[PDB]
Subunit: 142 residues, 2 copies
Amino acid sequence: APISLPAGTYTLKNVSTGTVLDLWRGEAAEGTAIQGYKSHGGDNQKWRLKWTGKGNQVTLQNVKSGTYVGTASNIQNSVNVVGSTTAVPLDIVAADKGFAIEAADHRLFVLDLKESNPANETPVIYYNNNATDNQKWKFIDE
Amino acid sequence: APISLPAGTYTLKNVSTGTVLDLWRGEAAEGTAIQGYKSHGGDNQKWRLKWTGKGNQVTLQNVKSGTYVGTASNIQNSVNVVGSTTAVPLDIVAADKGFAIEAADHRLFVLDLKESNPANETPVIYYNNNATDNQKWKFIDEK
């Protein structure tokens, strides 16, 4: 079958833990934490994938908040991934399990579920791509 | 339920032309042209996608020849994509239609069906990623 990753709304499930990409209660405030959390079907755990028109770059927009995957500071190892009105452009890169989500302009760095911790509220960070399983995300379309 | 692109055998259909990635005569000789061609189901038009173990990098191996997607010369604009005993490692990047096939160690460059020409034997080349449709490929998984 043809395999496509269409623009649309997704649950993004961390390969290492089975917890999902989660924006804290869906708050639209700048810097609102993005984290790993048990799937509960809330709109704060749904993300809109959309291509920007530049290269293959995309943004991810939280369904509850309307804010985007952004950054607490200058994208570096251990920098928090956070909700922002300013989107960080991303590349979705096929991995051996799921997809890596790369910083388009800082391609060394990917979304990383800190220390592969399945605990609720475990922080998601930018980190050097080692293609460990906490740096891979299953894309579940809805 | 989750959308995934598994390791397996694929037909790779150019988004612009509808023609597919084709190894010339399915020949195993080093430097054999890779090109666009009308789909006919031959093994020379089937490609094995496999992760190398380094990062998210993959290779594409021709089913007929056993050789890999590689290069004629130092990767630059318009350099031929060819069958080689030396794979060029790739990154498969989600595009607005299909996927871009990026050179992993020369990431400004993608596999490009030259000038979006749907003619048989149209060269596939390395070329700056402009995200034009001739630089996007439908990954058709063989079951």
